[PDB]
């Protein structure tokens, strides 16, 4: 099954800086980028990073080798740009990540053109 996550400042789940989702193996996490149809400058755009607890706590990435997906298409014709992460135990692709049972994984944001008012982050925990 799948867990929908609308990654935007207007989501109240991000306001306490402790947004946490609980998943089971072989499940998908659908991170929905901001989407519009509004001022072209006011359109939120983020860089999603799959990181470690240190990068999560400090809300700052250590390297570009952590960049997961780009929310660079806010007024996309087709629909909202998404990042669909299968929480699979095994991957045939090395640059991708394997999700072990009983572990926590962290996602962090960085505004592409806007100012960082608050820290946008999510914690995914495998049951």
């Amino acid at each position: 099954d799948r867990h929908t996550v609308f990654w935007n400042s207007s989501n109240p789940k991000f306001r306490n800086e402790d947004y946490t989702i609980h998943v089971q193996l072989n499940d998908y996490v659908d991170i929905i980028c901001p989407h519009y149809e509004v001022a072209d400058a006011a359109m939120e755009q983020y860089i999603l990073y799959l990181v470690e607890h240190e990068e999560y706590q400090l809300c700052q990435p250590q390297s570009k080798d952590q960049v997961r997906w780009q929310c660079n298409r806010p007024s996309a014709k087709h629909g909202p740009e998404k990042l669909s992460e299968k929480f699979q135990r095994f991957t045939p692709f090395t640059l991708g990540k394997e999700f072990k049972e009983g572990h926590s994984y962290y996602y962090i944001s960085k505004p592409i053109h806007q100012h960082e008012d608050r820290c946008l982050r999510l914690k995914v925990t495998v049951s």
Partner: protein, 286 residues
């Protein structure tokens, strides 16, 4: 090589292209990683410890067009069955490449019984356990080819039997010999044949103000399976009064007959020749 005409290109579709999976849902899955600071997509399957695996990934219906021989360029990664520290009994390190011809798109109505096995695709570089931490991508390239194709279109299929595969690219194309201008002759774009030795003899048409000399071989070219124009026979030469195109001689210069030679000056009195309005035998000093 010659000119390639691309009929399908998965990595160019920007994730927007959706391929049917059978059984529905289960099996292959679309992934979204980042490679060389570029967003990329891929079809993955890794049901190595389940068993009785028969997971089909079928591309969409591809309009054959004029194509006789299609070329299939696959870029994939395959993980070794000993890379699983748990131990996978029903594990495989291959997948089978299939194709099917049809005059109609069946859409969701997929039937394995209609697919012909092209080959058993094996990795040349197998993903070992140490590769993940090393962030080393072992990207395998396999080119296969099918011919002659005859129906309105085809599908390509990737059937998995319980392996750990990540398919990053599927690019189907056919070759053509390009529209050529050679030996003052025009040779049209010609579809390359299906049979490996075969060479289609293509007749040439002389360019504007060029002619095939009497006795001289008529301009001809041979089109090869790779799209190359091979073995030129004959040529065209600029007609009387003309000298890469055929243009008339500058005043006071002439050309009597069609030849390789350019327009010579006019001693001592257009153009095919220079008038004296005496000589008995019209290119000689009159």
């Amino acid at each position: 090589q010659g000119k390639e005409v691309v009929l399908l290109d998965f990595a160019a579709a920007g994730g927007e292209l959706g391929w049917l999976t059978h059984p529905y849902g289960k099996g292959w899955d679309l992934m979204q990683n980042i490679m060389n600071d570029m967003p990329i997509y891929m079809y993955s399957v890794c049901n190595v410890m389940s068993g009785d695996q028969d997971n089909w990934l079928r591309t969409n219906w591809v309009y054959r067009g004029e194509a006789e021989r299609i070329f299939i360029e696959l870029k994939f990664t395959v993980r070794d069955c000993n890379s699983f520290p748990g131990g996978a009994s029903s594990c495989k390190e291959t997948f089978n490449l299939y194709y099917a011809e049809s005059d109609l798109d069946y859409g969701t109505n997929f039937q394995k019984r209609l697919f012909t096995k092209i080959d058993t695709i094996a990795p040349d570089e197998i993903t070992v356990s140490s590769d993940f931490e090393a962030r080393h991508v072992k990207l395998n390239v396999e080119e296969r080819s099918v011919g002659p194709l005859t129906r309105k279109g085809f599908y390509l299929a990737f059937q998995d039997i319980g392996a750990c595969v990540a398919l990053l690219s599927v690019r189907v194309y056919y070759k053509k010999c390009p529209e050529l201008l050679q030996g003052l002759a025009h040779f049209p774009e010609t579809i390359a044949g299906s049979d490996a030795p075969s060479l289609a003899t293509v007749a040439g048409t002389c360019v504007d103000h060029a002619v095939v000399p009497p006795g001289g071989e008529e301009p001809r070219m041979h089109c090869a399976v790779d799209g190359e124009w091979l073995v030129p026979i004959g040529q065209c030469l600029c007609q009387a009064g003309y000298e890469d195109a055929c243009q008339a001689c500058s005043p006071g210069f002439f050309k009597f007959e069609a030849s390789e030679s350019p327009c010579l000056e006019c001693p001592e009195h257009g153009a095919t020749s220079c008038e004296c309005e005496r000589a008995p035998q019209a290119s000689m000093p009159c």
